[PDB]
Design an enzyme around this catalytic site. Structure first.
Site: not given
Ligand SMILES: *Cc1c(COP(=O)(O)O)cnc(C)c1O
Ligand SMILES: *Cc1c(COP(=O)(O)O)cnc(C)c1O
Lengths: 388, 394
Positions: A121, A202, A204, A237
Site C-alpha cells: 500500500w 496491517d 484491514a 472495509k
Molecule cells: C484500507 C487500508 C488501510 C486504511 O484504512 P482506513 O480505515 O481507511 O485508514 C490501511 N492499510 C490497508 C492495506 C488498507 O487496505
C-alpha cells in the site's frame, strides 16, 4: 511563511478518485451490483439504537472505550487474547493505527528500520518518508507466477536485525491479492524469532478473504509465537464505515509491566496528535460485536459480500479464458481479496483509461468488487485489445 | 523493544477525579471539570444536534470515503461562522481536523514545513496541552506575559513588551476568546494594538478558537479574530466545535489558513490535505456533518444559537451571583474580576496552599492553579464557594 511551502505530489489511489460510461476500478471500496457501497444492515441498526440511548457527548476515554478495546481484541485474536499483556488504542482509522504504531516503535527504538513488501500500500511508504524512517523492501510478489516469491521473502527477511520492524499484511494483500499460506506464516514466525524483528501487521481486510476467523489465522499464529507484536486494524472495509474513521492498535507484550508502559505511551500519542479518538464509528462496532443479534446479521452480510466477489473472480477469469484458448489469466481466481494486479505496463494502463474509460491504478491494480457480469466482458475485451 | 519505553505521565485529570471520587464527604464540590454542565450536573446533547443526527440517519445512503480535507459544506459553513462577511475563499485554505487539538497540531506541522526555524510564543499561562504538543514536536517555546496575578486581568504592558521580541517567521499563539484557563480577555482596542505589533514583527499569529459563543455572543467572540484577519495577510486559525456544539466526543474542528494570495492558497491547501493523509487519512465525518447540517438548516441553526444564547446568559448571571456573594462577604469589590471574566473558566488567584486548604477544609475541589468552572456552580454551591474563598484569605 506559507509561500515557502513546497508543492506536494498526488496520492496514487486518491488521485484517480479525482480524475475519474466510465468504469471505476480504482479506490479500495466495496460496491454492490449497482455500483454503490451501501451501509451494512447491522450498522444502520446500530446507529438507530445509538440515537435512542446516548444521553451525552462529553469527553470519553483517551485510548478509546473499554467495550471497543475488548470487542476488537476478541475479533482479531480470538481466544488468544491475553488481556494482561495487551495494550489497546482506539485510532482514527487503520491509517492512524499505522502512524501511531510507527510513532510508538520509534519512541522505543530511535534507530529502527522498516521492512515493507514489494509491493505494498503506497501510503505505507509516504508516511514513513514523512517520518524520516529508513525503508527496506522485501521480495513478496512474483510478477511471473503472479504469486508470492516465498524464497525471496525469506531471503530478504533473514537480514532483518534485532530492533527492526517488519510490516506484513495480515490477509488480502493490497495491492497484489497474492497471500501467504498458514505453513508459510509459520516459517516467517521462525525467521522473526531468530532475527528478533518486531512484526507490525496491517489488518484491514479481515472478512474479505476466506472468512473472519480464517483471515485472522496468520495473525493469531504470529501472536502465539512471537512475544511482542503490533497489530494495526481498520474497521473501514469489513464494517463498511469508511468515512467514520475507526480502527485500533494492539500492542502485544511479554509482561504485564511493559503493557502499562506501552498503554501509557499509546494514550500520550493520542493526546499530542488529536486528543480523544472519534466515538461514533467505534461505538457502532462495539454495538454490533457485543449485540448477538447484530453480530449474526453482520457476519451474514459480510459472508455474502466475500462470496459475491469470489463469484466475480471466476467469471472474469472465465471471460479472459475464452479469449485465450486456455492460459495464464487464471491467477485472478487464486488471488484472494478485493484487488488483483494484472500486469498491464504503465502506458497500457493510461491507454485503457483514456480510451476505454476504465480507471485502474497505474500499477494495474483492479478492484474486483467494482465489476459485474455487465462490465466484465467490457474489461475482458478492453485488456485484450490493449495487448502487451 | 517496548520495554525500553520511557514512562509517559497520566493526563492528571483522572488523578484529580480519583481524589474527588474517593472523598467520603457528603457535600464535596467539583469545579475542576473541563466540560459544560447544566443545573443537574449533566452535559446534555444540544437539541439542533439531536435533530441533525436524526436527519442524517434518515437521509444518508452511504459511508464511503469522502473528502480528504473535509466536506465543502463543512468548510464553507465554518469559515463563514468564524470570519463572517470577511471570508474570501480564493485566499482561505480550509481543513477538517480531528477536534480543535487536531487543528492545532496540524497548524504547527504546516508552519514547521514552511519554516524549520520556527519559534512559538505562548501566553503565561495557557492551555497546558499547547506546550505539551510543542514539546513533543521539539519546537522552541517562548512565553509572553499575560495573567496579572494581583488583578486577575491582562498584564497588557508586559504582553506587548515581550511580544516585541518576536522575530519574522516566529509564531504567536493567541486564544481568540474566553482565555483558558484565566478567563481574562483582551479588548478590541488591545487586539488592535497586538495587530500593530504582529505587523511590525512579521510574526505569524495562530489563533485558538475553542469557545465562540461562550463569552459575549457569536459575532462578538469572533471580533478579535476578524480584526487580525483583515489587518494581517497570513493568519492561521484553529477552531473547535466540541464545546459550542457540545459534540466533545465526535472530535470536530477545522484549520483555516488565510493566505496573502491565491497561489499560496493552493500551495497551503495541497499541503494541508497531504498532512491529513500522512497522519490518519480522511478526517471523521459524523461530527462535521452534524455541524454543517445545523449551520445550513435555518430552523436548526436558529434553535442552536438560541440554546447557546441561553447557556451563555446562564453562566454570565452565575458570575454576577458569585461576584455579588463575594461582595457582601468581603465588604469590598476585590473579587469584581469574577464578573468581568468571560468564558467557562476563571482563575481565582489562589496559591497551592490556599487551593488545598479549601479542599481539605471545605470539600471544594478545583484545578491546582485555582482554575474553576463556572458551569459547576449553582444557588447551593455559590454560598459555600464564596465562604471558602474568604476563609482561606484568598
Ligand atoms: C484500507 C487500508 C488501510 C486504511 O484504512 P482506513 O480505515 O481507511 O485508514 C490501511 N492499510 C490497508 C492495506 C488498507 O487496505
Ligand atoms: C477545549 C480546548 C481545545 C480542545 O478542543 P478539542 O476539540 O477538544 O480538541 C483546544 N484549545 C483550547 C484553548 C481549549 O479550551
Amino acid at each position: 511563511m506559507l509561500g515557502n511551502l513546497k508543492p506536494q505530489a498526488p496520492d496514487k489511489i486518491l488521485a484517480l478518485m479525482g480524475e475519474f460510461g466510465k468504469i471505476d476500478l480504482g479506490v479500495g471500496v466495496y460496491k454492490d451490483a449497482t455500483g454503490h457501497t451501501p451501509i451494512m444492515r447491522a450498522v444502520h441498526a446500530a446507529e438507530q439504537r445509538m440515537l435512542e440511548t446516548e444521553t451525552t457527548k462529553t469527553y470519553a476515554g483517551l485510548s478509546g472505550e473499554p467495550e471497543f478495546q475488548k470487542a476488537m481484541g476478541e475479533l482479531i485474536l480470538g481466544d488468544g487474547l491475553k488481556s494482561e499483556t495487551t495494550a489497546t488504542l482506539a485510532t482514527v482509522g487503520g491509517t492512524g493505527a499505522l502512524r501511531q504504531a510507527l510513532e510508538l516503535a520509534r519512541m522505543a527504538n530511535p534507530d529502527l528500520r522498516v521492512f515493507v513488501s514489494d509491493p505494498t500500500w503506497p501510503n505505507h511508504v509516504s508516511i514513513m518518508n514523512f517520518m524520516g524512517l529508513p525503508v527496506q523492501t522485501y521480495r513478496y510478489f512474483d510478477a511471473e507466477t503472479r504469486g508470492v516469491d516465498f524464497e525471496g521473502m525469506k531471503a530478504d527477511l533473514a537480514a532483518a536485525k534485532k530492533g527492526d520492524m517488519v510490516l506484513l499484511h495480515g490477509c488480502c494483500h493490497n495491492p497484489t491479492g497474492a497471500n501467504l499460506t498458514l505453513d508459510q506464516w509459520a516459517e516467517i514466525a521462525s525467521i522473526l524469532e531468530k532475527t528478533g524483528a518486531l512484526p507490525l501487521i496491517d489488518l484491514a481486510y479481515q472478512g474479505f478473504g476466506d472468512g473472519l476467523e480464517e483471515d485472522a489465522a496468520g495473525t493469531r499464529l504470529i501472536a502465539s509465537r512471537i512475544p511482542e507484536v503490533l497489530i494495526a486494524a481498520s474497521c473501514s472495509k469489513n464494517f463498511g464505515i469508511y468515512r467514520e474513521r475507526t480502527g485500533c492498535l494492539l500492542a502485544l507484550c511479554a509482561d504485564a509491566a511493559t503493557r502499562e508502559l506501552a498503554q501509557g505511551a499509546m494514550a500520550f500519542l493520542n493526546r499530542q496528535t488529536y486528543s480523544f479518538p472519534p466515538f461514533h464509528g467505534a461505538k457502532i462496532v462495539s454495538t454490533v460485536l457485543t449485540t448477538p443479534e447484530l453480530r449474526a446479521d453482520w457476519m451474514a452480510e459480510l459472508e455474502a459480500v466475500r462470496s459475491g466477489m469470489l463469484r466475480l473472480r471466476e467469471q472474469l477469469a472465465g471471460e479472459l479464458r475464452d479469449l485465450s484458448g486456455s492460459d495464464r489469466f487464471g491467477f485472478v481466481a487464486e488471488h484472494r481479496g478485493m484487488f488483483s494486479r494484472l500486469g498491464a505496463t504503465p502506458e497500457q494502463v493510461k491507454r485503457i483509461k483514456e480510451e476505454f474509460g476504465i480507471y485502474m491504478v497505474g500499477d494495474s491494480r483492479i478492484n474486483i468488487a467494482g465489476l459485474n457480469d455487465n462490465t466484465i466482458p467490457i474489461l475482458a475485451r478492453a485488456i485484450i485489445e490493449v495487448g502487451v
